[PDB]
Amino acid sequence: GFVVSVKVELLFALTDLNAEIIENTSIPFSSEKKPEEAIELIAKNVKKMCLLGVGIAISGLVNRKKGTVIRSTMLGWENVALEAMLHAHFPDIPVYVDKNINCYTLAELWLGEGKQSNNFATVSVGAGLGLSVVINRQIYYGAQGGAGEFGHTTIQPGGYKCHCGQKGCLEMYASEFYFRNRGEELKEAYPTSELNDFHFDKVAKSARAGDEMATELMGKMGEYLGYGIRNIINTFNPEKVIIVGEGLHHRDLFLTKIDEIASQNFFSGAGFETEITTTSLEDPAWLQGAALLVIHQLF
Amino acid sequence: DINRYTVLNLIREKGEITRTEIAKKCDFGMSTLTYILDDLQQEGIILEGKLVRFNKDYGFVVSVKVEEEQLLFALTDLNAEIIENTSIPFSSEEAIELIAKNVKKMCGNRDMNHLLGVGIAISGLVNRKKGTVIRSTMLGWENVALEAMLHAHFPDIPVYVDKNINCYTLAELWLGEGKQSNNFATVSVGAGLGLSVVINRQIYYGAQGGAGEFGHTTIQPGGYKCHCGQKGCLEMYASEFYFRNRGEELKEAYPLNDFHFDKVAKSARAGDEMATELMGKMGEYLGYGIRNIINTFNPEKVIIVGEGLHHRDLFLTKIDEIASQNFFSGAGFETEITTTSLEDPAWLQGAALLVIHQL
Ligand SMILES: [Zn+2]
Ligand SMILES: [Zn+2]
Numbered sequence A: 001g002f003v004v005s006v007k008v009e010l011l012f013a014l015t016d017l018n019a020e021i022i023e024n025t026s027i028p029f030s031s032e033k034k035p036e037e038a039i040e041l042i043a044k045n046v047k048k049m050c051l052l053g054v055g056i057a058i059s060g061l062v063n064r065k066k067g068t069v070i071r072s073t074m075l076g077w078e079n080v081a082l083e084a085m086l087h088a089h090f091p092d093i094p095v096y097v098d099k100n101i102n103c104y105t106l107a108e109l110w111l112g113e114g115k116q117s118n119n120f121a122t123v124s125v126g127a128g129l130g131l132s133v134v135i136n137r138q139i140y141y142g143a144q145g146g147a148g149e150f151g152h153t154t155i156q157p158g159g160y161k162c163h164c165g166q167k168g169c170l171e172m173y174a175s176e177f178y179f180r181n182r183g184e185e186l187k188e189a190y191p192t193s194e195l196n197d198f199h200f201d202k203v204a205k206s207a208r209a210g211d212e213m214a215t216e217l218m219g220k221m222g223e224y225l226g227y228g229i230r231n232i233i234n235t236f237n238p239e240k241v242i243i244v245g246e247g248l249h250h251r252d253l254f255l256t257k258i259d260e261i262a263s264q265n266f267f268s269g270a271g272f273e274t275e276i277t278t279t280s281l282e283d284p285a286w287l288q289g290a291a292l293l294v295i296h297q298l299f
Numbered sequence B: 001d002i003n004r005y006t007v008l009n010l011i012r013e014k015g016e017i018t019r020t021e022i023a024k025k026c027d028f029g030m031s032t033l034t035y036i037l038d039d040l041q042q043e044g045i046i047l048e049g050k051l052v053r054f055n056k057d058y059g060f061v062v063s064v065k066v067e068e069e070q071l072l073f074a075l076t077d078l079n080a081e082i083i084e085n086t087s088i089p090f091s092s093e094e095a096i097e098l099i100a101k102n103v104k105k106m107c108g109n110r111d112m113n114h115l116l117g118v119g120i121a122i123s124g125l126v127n128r129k130k131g132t133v134i135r136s137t138m139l140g141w142e143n144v145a146l147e148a149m150l151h152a153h154f155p156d157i158p159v160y161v162d163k164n165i166n167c168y169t170l171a172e173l174w175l176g177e178g179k180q181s182n183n184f185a186t187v188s189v190g191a192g193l194g195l196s197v198v199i200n201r202q203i204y205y206g207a208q209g210g211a212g213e214f215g216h217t218t219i220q221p222g223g224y225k226c227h228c229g230q231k232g233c234l235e236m237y238a239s240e241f242y243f244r245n246r247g248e249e250l251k252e253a254y255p256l257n258d259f260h261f262d263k264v265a266k267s268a269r270a271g272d273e274m275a276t277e278l279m280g281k282m283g284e285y286l287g288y289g290i291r292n293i294i295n296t297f298n299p300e301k302v303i304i305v306g307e308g309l310h311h312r313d314l315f316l317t318k319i320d321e322i323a324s325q326n327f328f329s330g331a332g333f334e335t336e337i338t339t340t341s342l343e344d345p346a347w348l349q350g351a352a353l354l355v356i357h358q359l
Helices: A035-048 A100-110 A177-183 A200-208 A212-236 A246-253 A255-263 A285-298 B002-014 B019-024 B030-043 B094-106 B146-151 B164-174 B241-251 B261-268 B273-297 B316-323 B345-356
Strands: A003-007 A011-015 A021-026 A054-058 A061-063 A068-072 A077-080 A095-099 A121-124 A130-133 A240-244 A275-278 B016-018 B046-048 B051-054 B060-066 B070-076 B082-089 B115-122 B125-127 B132-136 B141-144 B159-163 B185-190 B193-197 B301-307 B336-339
Touching: A003 A035, A003 A285, A011 A035, A011 A285, A021 A285, A054 A100, A054 A285, A061 A095, A095 A100, A095 A285, A100 A121, A100 A130, A100 A240, A100 A285, A121 A212, A177 A200, A177 A212, A200 A212, A200 A246, A212 A240, A212 A246, A212 A255, A240 A246, A240 A255, A246 A255, A255 A275, B002 B016, B002 B019, B002 B030, B002 B051, B016 B019, B019 B030, B030 B046, B060 B094, B060 B345, B070 B094, B070 B345, B082 B094, B082 B345, B094 B146, B115 B146, B115 B164, B115 B345, B125 B159, B132 B146, B146 B159, B159 B164, B159 B345, B164 B185, B164 B193, B164 B301, B164 B345, B185 B273, B193 B273, B241 B273, B261 B273, B273 B301, B273 B316, B301 B316, B316 B336
Parallel strands: A003 A054, A054 A095, A121 A240, A240 A275, B060 B115, B115 B159, B185 B301, B301 B336
Antiparallel strands: A003 A011, A011 A021, A061 A068, A068 A077, A121 A130, B016 B051, B046 B051, B060 B070, B070 B082, B125 B132, B132 B141, B185 B193
């Protein structure tokens, strides 16, 4: 009995019951306010790799009980009954959906750095901020399944507009979003600047090259990530905080900064430290997660 | 083993209940149930009228609140009702001598086999598991072994120490708004900012018993110097400390002398512009703090409480204007935000519930 994990960006993957990626694909497609069509390309590619279930990791708010995507501000999705829209293509196959950061966390819980820690917090640095908090090997969902919305905490009251409708969100300061938000006000202050594409890799690239504007952007993004992690430390008081995500590719330009600040937390004054590490798994562990999503519920 | 517990809880939860009323919601037989009720009866832990009830007076409890200029003390029944309360002054290791001395005064001539325990509410960073106060800026304390030290005088009986906001959270659980809900959050404000989140009717202590220090989350990078060392802590904008930090800079933009909370509040109510601006901004920042708590823990309801102040004096409409603009509200999920229904004594009942809920 095998499983197929899905991830919406689209990423597919065939795995056995140990979450091992046997065969993945990477279909190029944009799902900006396009859910009815996106599901048809999925169900298509899903049957192509061929199955006890399908797991779907995605960016947004989600109600796992009904399997509904309550809200994806990235993709602009409002109340899409994804768990039901797939029974049109696979009636009796159990389908489950979850927050991508909680899918990755399942991966850490069973392959990565969960084999020791029974209670920690995972934070995703990348194109936006994610958080997932484990308690006795259990992901915390809160009352309505929505806990962990840490990227929309206000780090700068009166700050940058955020896709959520609010201002000053952490995600606008402590991720790739920052670069866009702040790179414009830094165009005229840095006229002869190399940089012009404000994505992580481009900014990362210009910054190792010594380009001031990129050096500023990546410096500040770190500070704010340090704040965000320190807010997590002062709030949850976890044994450890694991940083993950495609941002780690450019770790050299932030992890140590993140540490300067986060280490300077409330509880450190009493000798007891809080390990801040990085993920042992690889980028394909988001898919092993979504796969695990179905596997755990089954057993 | 476990059965007594399940029967006994079911008996408090209702206060009064009958044998067959119990049996229904009990995964075992009447023959087993008779054993347990007959034994708990002779223990004196329950009482019969047909109807069986909990013995609030099988035992009694004392709680203690350790403060700046005083030491509170209380003697509750086993429902956490307060039969006797006193207070004694205290400025600043002899604090235990004082407590123990005062403990035995409360009881009067009461039987000492019936004193079931002692709960201590204190401010700062506590490790309830170890019975030690790790840090109390306010008092000038560091790794004090409150439990062990005090155990000297009451070795046969349990001492439990916890952070104020938790002691008051259990109060909410067993007496207030915490009885309806099972996953709420409690915020304190006054002295500084305190937070206790409850998960499955249980306080989240985290890895080393320190979660909830929400007052030192950064809400303004590089802003007002917190007493913690960090800069721009929430607690410097969303609490009585805001007025010390912003008070003097505003005098220049408004020509009020004292910046204690009850002073600013009262002055505002009298229509002073400066006080009003101060009272207004404190409510915004408090509003951000609660919005961050919502996006983070996602509780059923939030409970605001004054510590050394009356929550009605707060600008509740600005707190809620800001707080209700969270991430779950976009998808129309409104989180209930209210003040507490309890009063001052619930801090001391809280510390009594600390001992009571552990039996
Ligand atoms: Zn936002
Ligand atoms: Zn602080």
